[PDB]
Amino acid sequence: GLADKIGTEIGPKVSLIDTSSTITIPANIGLLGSKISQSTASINENVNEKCKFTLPPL
Amino acid sequence: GLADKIGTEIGPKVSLIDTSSTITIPANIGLLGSKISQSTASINENVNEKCKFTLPPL
Amino acid sequence: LADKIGTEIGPKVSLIDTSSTITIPANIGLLGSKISQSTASINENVNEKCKFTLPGVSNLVGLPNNICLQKTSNQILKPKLISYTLPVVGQSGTCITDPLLAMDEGYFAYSHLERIGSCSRGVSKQRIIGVGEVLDRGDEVPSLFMTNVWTPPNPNTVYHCSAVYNNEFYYVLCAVSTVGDPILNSTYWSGSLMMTRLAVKPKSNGGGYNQHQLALRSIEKGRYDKVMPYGPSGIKQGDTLYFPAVGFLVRTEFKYNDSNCPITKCQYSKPENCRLSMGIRPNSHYILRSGLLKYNLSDGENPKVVFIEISDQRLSIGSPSKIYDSLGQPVFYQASFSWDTMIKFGDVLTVNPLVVNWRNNTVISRPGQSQCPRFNTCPEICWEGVYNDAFLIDRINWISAGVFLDSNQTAENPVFTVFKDNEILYRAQLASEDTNAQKTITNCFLLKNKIWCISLVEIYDTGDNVIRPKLFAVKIPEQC
Amino acid sequence: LADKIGTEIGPKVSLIDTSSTITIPANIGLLGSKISQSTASINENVNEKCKFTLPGVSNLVGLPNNICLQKTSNQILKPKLISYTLPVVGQSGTCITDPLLAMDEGYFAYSHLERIGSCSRGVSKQRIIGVGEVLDRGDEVPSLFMTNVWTPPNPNTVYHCSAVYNNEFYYVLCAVSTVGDPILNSTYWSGSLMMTRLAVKPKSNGGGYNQHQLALRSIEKGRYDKVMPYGPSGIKQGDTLYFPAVGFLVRTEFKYNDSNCPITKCQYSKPENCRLSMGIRPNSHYILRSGLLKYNLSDGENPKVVFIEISDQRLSIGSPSKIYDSLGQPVFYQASFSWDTMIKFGDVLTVNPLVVNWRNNTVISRPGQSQCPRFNTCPEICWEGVYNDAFLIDRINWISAGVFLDSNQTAENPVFTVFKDNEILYRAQLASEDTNAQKTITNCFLLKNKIWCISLVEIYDTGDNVIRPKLFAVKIPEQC
Amino acid sequence: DIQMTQSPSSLSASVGDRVTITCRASQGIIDYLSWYQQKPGKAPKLLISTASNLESGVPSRFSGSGSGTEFTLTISSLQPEDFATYSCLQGYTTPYTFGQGTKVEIKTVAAPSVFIFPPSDEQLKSGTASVVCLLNNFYPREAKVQWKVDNALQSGNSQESVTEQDSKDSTYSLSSTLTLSKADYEKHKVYACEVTHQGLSSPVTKSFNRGEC
Amino acid sequence: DIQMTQSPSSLSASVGDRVTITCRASQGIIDYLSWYQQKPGKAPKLLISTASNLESGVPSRFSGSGSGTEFTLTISSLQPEDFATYSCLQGYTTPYTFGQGTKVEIKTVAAPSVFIFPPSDEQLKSGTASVVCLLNNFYPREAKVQWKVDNALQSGNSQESVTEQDSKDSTYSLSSTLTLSKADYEKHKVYACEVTHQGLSSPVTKSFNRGEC
Amino acid sequence: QVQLQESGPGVVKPSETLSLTCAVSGGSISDTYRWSWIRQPPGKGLEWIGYIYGSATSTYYNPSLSSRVTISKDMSKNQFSLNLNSVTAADTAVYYCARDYQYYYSGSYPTPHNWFDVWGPGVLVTVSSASTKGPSVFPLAPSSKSTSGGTAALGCLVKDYFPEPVTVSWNSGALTSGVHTFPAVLQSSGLYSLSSVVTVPSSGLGTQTYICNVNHKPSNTKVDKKVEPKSCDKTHHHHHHH
Amino acid sequence: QVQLQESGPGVVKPSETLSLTCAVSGGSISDTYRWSWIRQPPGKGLEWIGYIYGSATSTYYNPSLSSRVTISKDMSKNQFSLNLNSVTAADTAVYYCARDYQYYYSGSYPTPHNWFDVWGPGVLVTVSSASTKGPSVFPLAPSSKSTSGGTAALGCLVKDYFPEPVTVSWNSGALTSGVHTFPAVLQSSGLYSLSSVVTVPSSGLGTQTYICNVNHKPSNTKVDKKVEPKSCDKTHHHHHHH
């Protein structure tokens, strides 16, 4: 019953945690860093566009 | 040698991963959500302060 | 050592499972949701409080994004695996079937029925149904990012989901079935649907905001006895959704003129096959008639799912349809589950009623198993084939793109082709030659005025012997 | 089942260890670094491109943040565990000794020497040395957030680190020692230091930016034979750092007037004890003289670590000193490792040379073990006691705050007291009565004009029998 | 087409053995495979469909696993109602191709009692003379028979016939025929048949003389 | 102060047993504990310092673990050079308090040969008469002795002395003294001593008469 | 339950048209999406021929037999045929008719698992140019060299018949133990011949009657031949006439 | 190696000043941060008294003995004393002097692990008001009731001496097997008394000489008493004078 336990509730589950912990979640954190960089460049170009004043003297 | 392996390279290490995975890393993700909210409210009050135009007609 | 594994390791590994496969990816997804909701909020704050006075990813829109329009034999396409950011890769004992991939304005959907063991007779473990965001990683290359993930409580009773983006929400329509797959056990199917709204930008405590699984107390069927949504993606027309579907018409009511069955160039075909191949078996009680589901949100609290049937021009059996808004006008893929083994996709001339100008294509076909192989146009009684869609990436030259299985009968060798209606221009072999595959779902879009395409290709992994949906972000190149 | 555990489970659990305890928390920390660097960049972009023309957490600054200044017996303090966001909680077989906590302008530091088994004779597993950010969670309550984490390659040779914030970097100075702890094996210590700069806002590929471990090729000692940094935190004066330290003076050079030894009120004390208790053993070759390390960055590429000795007024043995910039002027804690068991902390009158106006306190003392217990002022030869610092939270009424161990000899019952120099105002019992503890490090700051305080209290957990540093964010209340 | 190669072509095991029968395919079928137990003189019977399903009526000792190109038909506790022909079938594409088949035998070694029969006089009146050498109740079935005529091996005139395994004593019966003419029967004296067998240490050779009765 | 309570106060085990000696403290010391082996007639010897360290010179059969309030002194393979007094010591605060001590004995059961001695005539000239009852080579040491004078129990005149365990045959020797006067010696006839022992099923009682030689 | 039954000639001369029929009992062929045919060459493995739809007339055929096989239909008499044209000797097989079955999983996937559930009892069809002929039976008489450890064997040698099969029983079906009726082989002349023996105790020779009962129905031949020991004394009595 | 050695009176009358001395050989007390004293009541456990610094004169004392114990010093003669005042009978113990040792881990933590590494050989100091007295030795003569399974025991009964110890050897140190010298008990009168026997084979009574050799050095008393069987015939010869 120990081999069935370790090939049922450990083996596939440890393989699932390994896939989720060195492939999935680090890639989501890297793409979330890319989201921070995208969001920052987006809001910076929004400020560089929509905050701009020019007017000649009357 | 199997008990020494499971109390050396599994037991403490699975307890370490459990502490790091339901206490540490979810709390860092929650505080990172709090950082997003702090950063958003900070940059919104910066825009509400330092983007403000008023001038009477000459 | 039964006590240590049973107490100190077992339940803790169960907790690490639950954490790092449920609540840590849902919180990273909700974290990216708060990134994007925050950025939208500060951009609205700048557009208010800096608009002074005086005392990303989007779908194919009408801009001339130039691509390679000349046939080459050189490997100009470069496929890129972006499947690693999803819950594609389970363990070695789960087969991942019944997928979905449905993109519109940067916010996708993704569902899959995770089974146990074999791909056919396995027990359904769960059914992820999860929307997200299409992004850019650090190399000008798109990649998916699931924000909101939902699973139904009873995974054995959710079949054939169709998923349409609608105005920063995502509306996914499935079929409740306690008696098995309603295509198969059609006479005993209860005739009940359920729609599950998702939000592509979820919130912290959005209980009734994120997953408000609506009821459907009124389905406008018409002649059809039952109506089921059938196909991966759809379109929106303002407040009106269009889920691809099929309608179970009783065969005694089905009226068809046998003179229209094209037996002209073919001798092994009676004119009585085109009627009988409209069902999955030529003595079946029902007949599969593909179409759409007009779901207008302007009907109040309890809207009505209206079944629009398809026009009878180039009519075959109900397939997973896929209507998709490409370059402004909807284009309607409708797969070849019958004798008409050529690709059957075209521009939509009018949505209600559905009349599709089917493109007269003769170089793109799908592998059928027994009677109706790749490149068969003889009308023969079969319900065979696979789903290999195609996204319209150029309407000026009528070029489209998708992943197609270049073999006659063995559903193998998935090849990302980009083809005109009479000549395949260029192509990319995604895998090895005998890489067995299935249903492929190709969606394309614009990443910074570049046409990228996400083709969810169910590749059978020869290593651990189960089917996994591998995505393939393939850039349509401009230089040939 | 030796093969499955040895191959399919063992190395995979090693990979999950490495991932979810090294590279996932370092990437979440670097993610928070990119949050804050991005917010600083967009705020600078708004301050440039919206400054039109015409055609958080900070330390105690000079604002009257009103707190409770009246003695009560009611439990008005409410301690809050915020230790869960750090790598405090290891497994049950590791004791976490030699800690650090050093806050200035919202960017802390944290180091700990993780041992194996017993807290004294264990093998040093690793030494995290990691800076971060002090934040606010969703309840107006601070909490730590480590961004940058570094470990030295040889954990047995890094002793007694001191850590000062300096202008969005963090400069941590330790002592290289191949021959054990330089307080103990002082005659054979090599006399070599190393400084490790850290960045509190690290970057993606900041190799030489984040950890540029500087060399120290010139130490200005003076009379002192060796100089070692000794104590958790320090101050900066512009470009000039001040690491707390100690200086190993040869006893034959040490000149002390025995008439200054206060034997007036006490009869069991010779006037010859105040000289001999200046070393850890009254025949030791060296004498511990606490002080500072003036590290001015304006000396070029290779600066000089200058040892400033302390003034001889109320002079005892070298303790972990802690200079800290509170309410504008530096305040100098210097622990009681000798006969003077009262608390020995005060405002700094001048930094170079170090002359500290020691506060004449008589209600706050530390538990000494054998000869010099809590509330002993008789000059007796001992090197006994523990580190219990105090942060100045009010200078107008001279109120300070810290965690103190309310028992005479058994170092137990850590109590967060907030005290005047002659009366303890109010206090919070952090744990149970016989909760054995050690070194406590209290740092305070302002979270939205509220004085919060982070007291790293090494509580011995009675459950799994090892010492863990438990933080305690305690709000100094205004309503009594 | 898809070729279905099984290994081994004929396996032999005692009652209660663990029998693993393979069927390797040329093109990779996903799991579209069925196992057939063909009893002698009977129709084939579906055992294990989709390479992992135990069909309704097939006992639990039959199990199947494997997918892709390598397949396993596992018989856990082998029983005397299971010694028959096992075939695989691929359903992934058409033409449906079966394997060559797997013959399953009972591993109970027994030695033959060898007999020999002279031709009858009415058969000599008929014009031909067939010497018949008999080998009853032997195992294994794969054996060696040499026709010797006056101590000389004859090849090209031998027709052998071995029965399928009996369900009573689990052994085999051999029958080899040396079809010769009447004049060529009268041209010789001694007609011998050599038996090479596993249970027989020495080659047992039964013979008879024409002039001896 | 800190009280150090050991359990058990006197443990008995054969050669090669696993001996676990505890020392429970009143206030929680962290790990500031040392173990002392006090051999009889010798100085104590440091065994296990800091509750987990094997000291230089103490063999590997001694091991220690535990911290806080419960402590374990583990003797894995017990040897004949280890039967002595074991004490704990706390060093966490001062006064340093030892435990009450743990006595360790060899579990080898043996039955006593009981002797008895009449007082000598020169002792009768000295004025007193001490009857001595002897019990040699017994185990366990905890036994029961009743002085009987003319079949009547006497209490209040008994002084017992039992040696420490010999290293030759691993047993004990008892000596009880009934100190009585000369006239009270002459007032009685029979002087008996009852032995209650584990190895003795019946209470062995040795006696003698005053008028009998 | 649907019960199949083949019917047709086991005698087909080469380069002709095989005419089989698998009439269906217990079910209609208006049901059952496919109906197949499988042959099995003796000494070789199973191989599949082609299907017919039942409700339709569309066929598939094995491309190794594509230009030859015709599968016809009869909806009324519930039967479906087989027409293998230009038959050769290598087409000698057992032509099973088989009910086909499909396992559709997940009906957005129309590739079913295919197998055959209900098989017919089979029919042995040998392509042979020989004519129908009754057997010639001669006994395998026991001799002194036909003894092995108290066991003496005897039998009958069946020769020169066509077609298959014969039913050779012993003493009107009473003798069962020791009976071994061998499978027949095809001679070089084109006719069948099998052997059939029984191994009896050697003390029972001379007391028990052993007669093999041959029955060949396509030639209507019934042969009963007694097996007797060989006489050895009747030849050496040459009379000396003085 | 540093080698300790106690010295002092084992005879101290109650309510007086104990005057011990642990002179140190092999090392100076200018070394060694602490030097302690430990007593051990016989029948009870160890308990610690108080330390002295060696280089300093600062003391600590056990608060159960705080008002009594004085630990004095002598740097020149390398010795340190002990002065337990107002001694009672419950202070009867073995006063060990002990070299103290400290294990400082991590010298920002000044709480050492404390233990004692080098102990003195100990000295038995009994608080008694009795005067020094030599023993009275009377033999435990063997009788007919002193037999058990071929074994006959004999010994000497030592009585009424002070102080400890006596050394009772058998036949000038030649007899070792069977020798059991019992520990002494304190009488109600205040004097010591022990027993000492030897168990010999019963066939050796009448052939071997057994003499216990008592030696008490503080009273200078040496007693040699022979153990003989009791005579039984010399009393019943009453002469009848006719």
Residue numbers in the entry:
A (entry chain C), B (entry chain D): 96 to 153
C (entry chain A), D (entry chain B): 97 to 151, 177 to 601
E (entry chain F), F (entry chain H): 1 to 213
G (entry chain E), H (entry chain G): 1 to 242
What's written in the study?
The Nipah (NiV) and Hendra (HeV) viruses are nonsegmented single-stranded RNA viruses belonging to the genus Henipavirus of the Paramyxoviridae family. HNV cell entry is a complex multistep process involving the binding of G to host receptors, the activation and structural rearrangement of F, membrane fusion, and the release of the viral genome. Because of their critical role in viral invasion, G and F are major targets for developing therapeutic monoclonal antibodies (mAbs). Here, we isolate a panel of Macaca-derived G-specific antibodies that cross-neutralize HNVs via multiple mechanisms.
